[PDB]
Amino acid sequence: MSKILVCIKQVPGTSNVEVDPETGVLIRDGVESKLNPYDLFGLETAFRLKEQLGGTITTLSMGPMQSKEVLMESFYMGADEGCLLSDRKFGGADVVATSYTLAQGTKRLGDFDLIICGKQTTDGDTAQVGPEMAEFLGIPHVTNVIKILAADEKGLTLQMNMEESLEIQRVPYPCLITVDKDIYTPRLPSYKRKLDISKNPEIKILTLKDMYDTNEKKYGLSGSPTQVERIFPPESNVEKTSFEGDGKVLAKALLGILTEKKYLG
Amino acid sequence: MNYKKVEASDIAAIKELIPAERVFVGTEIGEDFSHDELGSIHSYPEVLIKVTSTEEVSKIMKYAYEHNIPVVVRGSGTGLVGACVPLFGGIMLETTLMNNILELDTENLTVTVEPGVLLMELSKFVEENDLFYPPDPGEKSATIAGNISTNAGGMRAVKYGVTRDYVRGLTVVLANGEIIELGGKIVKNSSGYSLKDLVIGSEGTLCVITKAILKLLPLPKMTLSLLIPFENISDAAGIVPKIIKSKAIPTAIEFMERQTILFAEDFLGKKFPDSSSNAYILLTFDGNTKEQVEAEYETVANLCLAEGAKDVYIVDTVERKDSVWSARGAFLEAIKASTTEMDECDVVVPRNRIAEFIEFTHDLAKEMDVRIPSFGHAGDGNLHIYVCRDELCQADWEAKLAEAMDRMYAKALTFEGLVSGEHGIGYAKRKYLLNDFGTEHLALMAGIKQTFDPKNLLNPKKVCQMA
Amino acid sequence: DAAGIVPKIIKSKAIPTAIEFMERQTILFAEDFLGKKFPDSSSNAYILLTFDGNTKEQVEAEYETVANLCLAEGAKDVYIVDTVERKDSVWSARGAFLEAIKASTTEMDECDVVVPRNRIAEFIEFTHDLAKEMDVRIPSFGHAGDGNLHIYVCRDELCQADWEAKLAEAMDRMYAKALTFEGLVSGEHGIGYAKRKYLLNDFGTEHLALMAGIKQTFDPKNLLNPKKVCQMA
Amino acid sequence: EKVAIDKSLYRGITVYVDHIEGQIHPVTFELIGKARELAAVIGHPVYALLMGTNITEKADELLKYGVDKVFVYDKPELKHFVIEPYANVLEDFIEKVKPSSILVGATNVGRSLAPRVAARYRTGLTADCTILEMKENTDLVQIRPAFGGNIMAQIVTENTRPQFCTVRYKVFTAPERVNEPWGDVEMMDIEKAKLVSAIEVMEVIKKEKGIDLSEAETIVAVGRGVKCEKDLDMIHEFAEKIGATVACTRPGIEAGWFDARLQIGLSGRTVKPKLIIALGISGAVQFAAGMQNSEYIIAINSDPKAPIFNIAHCGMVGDLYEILPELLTMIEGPENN
Ligand SMILES: Cc1cc2nc3c(=O)[nH]c(=O)nc-3n(C[C@H](O)[C@H](O)[C@H](O)COP(=O)(O)OP(=O)(O)OC[C@H]3O[C@@H](n4cnc5c(N)ncnc54)[C@H](O)[C@@H]3O)c2cc1C
Ligand SMILES: Cc1cc2nc3c(=O)[nH]c(=O)nc-3n(C[C@H](O)[C@H](O)[C@H](O)COP(=O)(O)OP(=O)(O)OC[C@H]3O[C@@H](n4cnc5c(N)ncnc54)[C@H](O)[C@@H]3O)c2cc1C
Ligand SMILES: Cc1cc2nc3c(=O)[nH]c(=O)nc-3n(C[C@H](O)[C@H](O)[C@H](O)COP(=O)(O)OP(=O)(O)OC[C@H]3O[C@@H](n4cnc5c(N)ncnc54)[C@H](O)[C@@H]3O)c2cc1C
Ligand SMILES: [Fe+3]
C-alpha cells in the first residue's frame, strides 16, 4: 500500500557452476549477471498492488556497483525509485549481516507499508534473508505467499502455503512478505521506459556513513557468525541394476527400494 | 495397377537378403506403421523391413522391381499429409535403425549423416562442436531424410532458409536398385541438371535417400528476443518489410494473436507476460558478442516504436525466454487440447498478403461458426491454420471442413500463393495442387516420376500421382 | 598456407564477402597488362578478402578478428585496403586476370573445376607439376572460399598438331584428377557442348540416363537445344 | 583479535517438534535419531521443544524415541503458526535452558521460525542441510547444497550459540523405539503479553488441487501395457501410497483415459521428478526425451529389449499385472500385521 519496498539481488546469469579442485573459488563460466527469477515474482507482486492501491515502489539492493544494473532493470519493469547499498565494508556477509544492512538501509529510506522479498536467491539458496530482515525491523512477516486475496489499504489477506495445507492470514501494515515461485507471471522490461531519460529515478547509493548504526562490527565479514570452510561438487552415482524372476521376487525388490528411499510403498 | 501381392515365397526371399529380426510380417507390424500424424488414412504394409545399409536398400529395390511390389519409405512417421502411408500395402522400408552420424568435416563445415538420424540428435551433435544446423522444423524427432524429402522448414527460414539450402550431397537408390551419388562436399554446382534438387521435396516418390551431406554454419553464441505488441494483425504484419530493410535481420519473426495465446495459457497454466494487446510480433536476434546483438535489437526497437507499437519488451534472460517461447512452442498442443479433432492448413502467401489472409480466416470463422485459430511466421508468409471440429456431428463436420478448406485454398490461389510451404502435398493436398497448378504442370511432374520410376512402385498415388 | 587459413577464417564467425587466392605468377601477368605494379608482390601467394557492413565499427570488428587470426597462423603481414583508390589498385588487378592471360598467349582453353575446399592447395600444386612436365603454361586462380578454380592452358608458340595433343592431355589429366578429388567438371560455367565427355566420365551412364529421360519429358521431340549437356555426352 | 565465548554454558541438542495441531511431522523423528547420534560424540543430552494448544498428551511419544527432556509450551494462542508467539517462546526457551544446537526441519514453518530467532540472537543458521558432523569441541559441521544443488558447502559456526540448522526431510532415518522410556516432560510457561500477534489466522484449508506434472517430484507413468481403463484403479491406489502423480504416454491420451496435460514427452510435458516409475512403457524417443533427466527411473516392462532399460536406473523385467496388486498386498503386510 502506498510505500512498497522490494529487495532484489544480482545473481550469476546461470547456475551451471563447478569448482576447481584446488582453487577453492567457484568456476563461474562468465559474468552476464541478471536479476534473479524469484525476485521477479516479488517485483510483479508489487506491481499488482500498485495498480490497486496507487502508491509508490522502491527497489533495494546490496552488492557492488555492478548491482546498479538490476536496479535499472527494475526501473524498466515499472519501479519508481531505487537504492544501492554499495560499500567495501559490506562484502563477505552471510544472511545475518546481509539482513542487517538491508534493514539499516530500510530505516534510512523511511517507513514502508510493505516489504516484498523474493523466495530465495539462485547462488545462496538459503531462503532466509527475508525472515531475518523483518526481525531487525521488528515488523510481522509471512513467508511463501501464493495468493493475495484482499488488498485493503490497512493490511493484506494472504494465502501462505505449507507442504499440504493453505493458511489464510490477515496481516496488517507494516509487514514483510516473501512470495514464492509462480505467484504471477512477471512482466517484461519495457524498451519504451528505457528511452525516457535513461530512466527518470537516479539510483541513490548508501554507504556505512549513511546508516543510523555506523559501526562496522555488525556489517560485512565481521558481523558474520558463519563462514564457508570448503566448497566441493556433490558426489552422485548412477547404478544400473536389473531384476528378473517374476512373482513377488520383484515385488520385494521394489518395496525394498521404495522403503530405502523412504517412500514407504 | 498390376501390383503383385506379397506372398509367403516373397517373405522367404526377403529373409535371405535381410536378417529375420529386422523383417516384420502380418501381426508383428504394429499399429504405428499403418498411419502418420495426418490420422485420416490407415493402411498396413505387408512387409516391414528395418534397413541398415545402402546395399541392403538396393537389394530390396532390386527384388521389388523384379517382382512388381510397391515400396514406401518411412522415417519417424511424423509428416502431416499422409505421405508415408502404404495405400497399396507392399514393402515398407523403415530407416530409424540407420541413426549413425558418419563423418563431421570441420574443414569443409559439412556433416555426413545416415537416413534415420533424428533432428534432435543431429543438432545436439553439431552444437557440441560449435557448429550449427539452421533448419528447425517444429518436431525434433523427425528423420533428417524425412526433412529432405519433405523440404522441411521452420522458424529460422527468414534468415537462414529451409532444408533445401543445406543439402550438399545425396546418395540415393532408384526403384531398380541403382545407387546414385548426387552432390558432394563441393560448394558450387553447375554440372548438368540438378537431380539433387528434385529429390528435395519429392516425398519418397523418386528414390530412397541412403546418405546425406549437410552444410553447417558456425554457431552463434548470444541470442536475444523482442516482444512487440500491436493493435491488430494488420499493423503487426506491416512492420516486417521495414524491419528487414533496416539491415538488422531477425532469426525468427512470429506473429501471434491474442486468441491463440489464450489457448496456450489454458494449456500451460501460466499467463503470458503481457496480453493487453490483440496481436504480437516475436522477434529473435543472434550474434557472437553482447554488443552487436544490442546494436541489432535497438535498431529494430527504435524503429518499431516509430510506427505505432504500444511498447517493445526485451526478452534477454533464459527464464524470460522460456516464459515466452514455451507459449509459442505449445501453440499446436493447446489447439489440440481444446477440440475433439482438427485439420491442418499450411498455405504460404506473399508476405504483403499475410494480414489480409489472417483477417479472411476471421470472417470465415464467424460465417461458418467453426473455430479457426491461426499463427505462423511473419517473415516468410507461411501460415499455420487449423479448422477445429469442436462439437459438430460427423455429417455436419465433414461438410463444414470441406467448405472451410476449399475456400481457404481458393483464396490462397487468388493471393498468388501455394498449397503448402512446410508440410508438403502427400495424399491429403493432392486435389488442391491440381487446382493451383494446371494439368500441364502436373503432367511434367508425372513424367518425371515415370523417368525415375517407370513401374510406378515408389510411393503410387502421392503428390502428383492421381491429383 | 593460403588455402589453409580459409576454414579458420569462416569458423571465427567473421564471414568475408569474397575470398580470393592469387599466386605471384598470375599477378605478374596483370602488372604487364595494366602497366601498374601490384602494391606488394614480395610473396608467392595471396589471400584477398572483402568484408561488408552498415557501420564503420561493424566492419572494423569483422576485419580485426580475421587479421588477428591470420597473423597468429603464419601470415607475413596483413594489409588494410580501405579507400576507393586502394581498392581500385588491388581489385583492378584481380579483375584483369582473365584479360592478362589472354594478352600473353596466342590462344587458350579453360577449366572451371570445383573441388572440396580442403583440396584446393593440392590441385593448384598439381597444375604446377603438370605445367612443368608438359612444358605448357598453366596459370590459375579462383575463389578460395568455395573451391572453384579457374584454370587456363595456353598454347603459347606450339604448332597446331602439337597444341591439340597437349591440350587434350592436359585437360584429360586435370578432369581425371578432379574426379579423384571428388569434385565436379564445372562449378560456374556449365557443361554445354565442350564438357560433355567429362560429364560422362564423372557421372555414370545411369546418372546421365536420368538426365536424358528428364529432357524427354520436357521436350519429347528433342527440339530445344539438342546434343548439349546430357546428350551424346 | 576476537573475544571468545565459553561453550560449556551451552549444552544439549534441541529438536523442535514440527506438527500441525497435534499430528507430528515425520521430519521430527529423523532428527531425534540424528541428535542422539551427534550428542553421543560430545556427551550432551537431547531436548525437544513442543508448542501448541492441546498437545501435552503428545509428549511421551517423544519420550519413546530417546529424548531426555520434552519442554512443552501449551498455551491457547499457539494453535496455528503465527511467528511472534512462536519466536517469543523459542527465545524464552533459549534464555532458560541454553541449548548448544537447535535442529529444526526444512518445512515452511521451520524455514520461517528458525531465521526469526537466529537473527534475534545474531547467531548462525544454515539452510536445508544434508550431512551433520559433530566436533568434540561442540562445533556443528553443516554440509548443505547450494546453487540449486550444483555445489555443496561446508559451514561452521564457531563463536555464537545456539547454532541453528534446518535439515532436509527424508535424509536421515528415524531410530528404533526404546522399550523403556527414560527422561521427563517439563511444563513451561510464558506471560500472555509475549503471545499476542498482529497476524491473525482466518482458516487452514487443506490442499485439494491436483499438482501439475512439471511441479511433481514423484510420478507413476503408465503406457500401452495397461489394457483397460478399470486397471487404472489398481494404479491410482498405488500412486497414492507413495504420493505420486499419475501420468501416461500418448496411447493413454488417444484412449481418453487422461487429460492432455498429463502426457509426458515432446508432445506433452518435460518432467524432472525425483522418482518416476514407468509401467508398461517402451522407451520411445518421444516419451524418453521428456523424462530422461529424472534422478531415478524405475522401469517395469515385459520385454527385456525395450529401450527404457537403457536409461532406467532400476530395470525390472516382468508383468505389471502380477507385480502391483501383489505388491499392494505387500503394502498392508509389513504395515498392518
Ligand atoms: C555457497 C554458499 C553457501 C552459503 N551458505 C550460507 C549458510 O548456510 N548460512 C548463511 O547464513 N549464509 C550462507 N551464505 C551466505 C549468504 O547466503 C549469501 O552470501 C548472501 O548473503 C546472499 O543471501 P542469500 O542468497 O542467502 O539470500 P536468500 O535468503 O537466498 O534470498 C532471500 C531474498 O532476500 C533478498 N536478498 C538476498 N540477498 C540480498 C542482497 N544482497 N541484496 C538485496 N536483497 C537480497 C532477495 O529478495 C531474496 O529473494 C552462503 C553463501 C554461499 C555462496
Ligand atoms: C508436431 C509436429 C510439428 C511439425 N512441425 C513441422 C514444421 O515446423 N515444419 C515442417 O516442415 N514440418 C513439420 N512437421 C512435419 C514434418 O514433415 C515432419 O516432421 C518430417 O518432415 C517428416 O519426417 P519423418 O521422419 O517424420 O518422415 P515420414 O513422415 O516418415 O516421411 C515423410 C516423407 O518422407 C519420405 N521419406 C522418409 N525417409 C525417406 C528416405 N530415406 N528416402 C526417401 N523418402 C523418405 C516418406 O516416404 C514420406 O514421403 C511437424 C510434424 C509434427 C507432428
Ligand atoms: C510426432 C510424434 C510425437 C509423439 N510425442 C509423444 C509424446 O510427447 N509422448 C508420448 O508418450 N508419446 C509420444 N509419441 C508416441 C510414441 O511413439 C510412443 O512413446 C509409443 O509409440 C508408444 O508408447 P508406449 O511405450 O506407451 O507404447 P508401447 O511401446 O506399445 O508399449 C508396450 C510396451 O509395454 C510392455 N508391456 C506390455 N504389456 C505389459 C505388461 N503386462 N507388463 C509389463 N510390460 C508390458 C511391452 O513389452 C512394451 O515394451 C509421439 C509420436 C509421434 C509420431
Ligand atoms: Fe511453420
State how far Cα B212 lies from the chain centre: 17
A208: which 3 cell numbers?
556505512
Q: Which residues contact A48 (CB under 8 A, 6 or more apart)?
A: A148, A184
Distance from residue D224's CA to the centre of ligand 3 (Å): 6
Amino acid present at B314? I
Pocket test for ligand 2, best of B84, B120, B199, B332 (most atoms within 8 A of CB): B84
Instruction: Starting from the CA of residue D288, give the closest ligand.
Output: 3
Strands (E), C76-229: 108-111, 140-143, 149-154
Collapsed DSSP state (helix, strand, coil) of residue A143: strand
Q: Measuring CA to CA, how many Å separate B148 from each of B93, B174, B186?
A: 16, 16, 18
Torsion of Cα atoms, D300 then D302 then D308 then D311, to 10°: 60
What is the CB-side half-sphere exposure of residue D13 using CA atoms within 13 A? 26
Half-sphere exposure in the Cβ direction for C53 (13 Å, CA): 17
Question: Domain check: are D162 and D226 in the same one?
Answer: no
Burial C132-155 (b: 16+ CB within 10 A, else e): eebebbbbbbbbbbbbbbbbbbbb
Q: Examine residue D195 and state whether it is found in any structural domain, yes or no.
A: no
Give the count of domains, chain D.
Answer: 2
Give the burial class of D326: count Cβ atoms within 10 A of its Cβ; 0-12 exposed, 13-18 middle, 19 or more buried: middle
Residue A124 CA: nearest ligand 1 atom is 25
Report the C-alpha gap between B47 and B25 in whole angstroms.
5
CA distance D317 to D309: 9
The one-letter code for the residue type at B89 is: G
Q: Residue A171: CB within 6 Å of ligand 1?
A: no
| Structural domain boundaries, residue B198 | 101-218
What angle do helix axes C205-218 and B439-452 make, rounded to 10 degrees? Answer: 160
Q: Cell numbers for A160, please give them.
A: 501462505
- Radius of gyration of chain C from its Cα atoms, rounded to whole angstroms: 20
**Burial track B12-48 (b if 16+ CB lie within 10 A, e otherwise):** eebbeebeeeebbbeeebeeebbbbbbeeeebbbbbb
- How many degrees, rounded to 5, is the angle at CA D43 between CA D41 and CA D44? 110
- Co-location of D282 and D319 in the same domain: yes
Show Cβ contacts of residue D231 under 8 Å, excluding neighbours closer than 6 positions: D321
Task: Indicate if D242 and D174 belong to the same structural domain.
Answer: no
Q: Per DSSP, which regions of chain D are E strands?
A: 13-16, 19-20, 23-24, 46-51, 69-73, 101-105, 125-129, 131-134, 140-146, 151-157, 163-167, 184-187, 200-206, 218-222, 245-248, 275-279, 297-301, 314-317
Is the domain of D29 the same as that of D110?
A: yes
The whole-angstrom separation of Cα D300 and Cα D312 is: 10
CATH code: domain of residue B360: 3.30.70.2740
Q: In this structure, are residues A57 and A187 in contact, taking their beta carbons and an 8 Å threshold? A: no
Q: Provide the sign of the torsion angle of the four alpha carbons B168, B174, B177, B180, taken in this order.
A: negative
Ramachandran angles phi, psi of C153, nearest 5°: -105, 120
The helix (run of H) or strand (run of E) holding residue B447 is helix B439-452
CA–CA distance, A19 with A49 (Å, rounded to integer) = 42
Tell me the CA–centroid distance for residue B332 and ligand 1, in Å.
41
Q: Is the CB of B328 under 6 A from ligand 2?
A: no
> Is D133 part of a structural domain of the chain?
yes
Same domain as B61, residue B132: no
Same domain, B30 and B114: no
Co-location of B88 and B110 in the same domain: no
Contacts 24+ apart (CB under 8 A), C55-61: C58/B292, C58/B295, C61/B289, C61/B292, C61/C14
d(CA A114, CA A116): 6
Same domain for D172 and D24: yes
List of E strands, B353-418: 374-377, 383-388
Residue D209 lies in a domain: no
Q: Do B314 and A37 touch (CB under 8 A)?
A: no
Q: Is C39 on the interface with B (CB under 8 A)?
A: no
Where helices occur in B289-341 by DSSP H, the ranges are 290-304, 318-329, 331-337
Q: How many CA atoms lie within 13 A of B228 on its CB side?
A: 30
Resolution given for this structure, in angstroms: 2.4
Identify the H or E element spanning D111.
Answer: helix D110-121
Nearest neighbour of D289 by CB, restricted to B120, B267, B337: B120
Range of the structural domain that residue D246 is part of: 218-330
Contact between B314 and A188 using a beta-carbon 8 Å cutoff = yes
Distance, CA of A162 to CA of D173 (rounded, Å): 22
Do B347 and B402 share a structural domain?
yes
For ligand 3, the distance from its centroid to the CA atom of residue D251, given in whole angstroms, is 7
In sequence order, what are the residues at sequence separation of 6 or more whose Cβ sits closer than 8 angstroms to the Cβ of residue A126? A95, A120, D126, D127
Strand partners, B331: none
Residue D250 lies inside a defined structural domain of this protein = yes
In the beta sheet, which residues pair with residue C23?
A: C45
Cβ-Cβ contacts under 8 Å, A34 against chain B: 317
Contact (CB, 8 A) for C14 and C68: no
Same domain, B175 and B153: yes
Q: How far apart are CA A100 and CA B122, in angstroms?
A: 52
Q: Hey, is D172 helix, strand or coil? A: coil
Q: How many A from CA of B350 to the centre of ligand 4?
A: 15
Neighbours of chain C (3+ CB pairs under 8 A): B
In this structure, what CATH number is given to the domain that contains residue B19? 3.30.43.10
Does residue D303 have its Cβ closer than 6 Å to ligand 3?
Answer: yes
- Under DSSP, is residue C131 helix (H, G, I), strand (E, B) or coil? helix
Residue D267 annotated as part of some ligand binding site: yes
Under 8 Å between Cβ of D103 and D35:
yes
In a domain, D181, yes or no: yes
Q: What is the DSSP letter of B281?
A: E
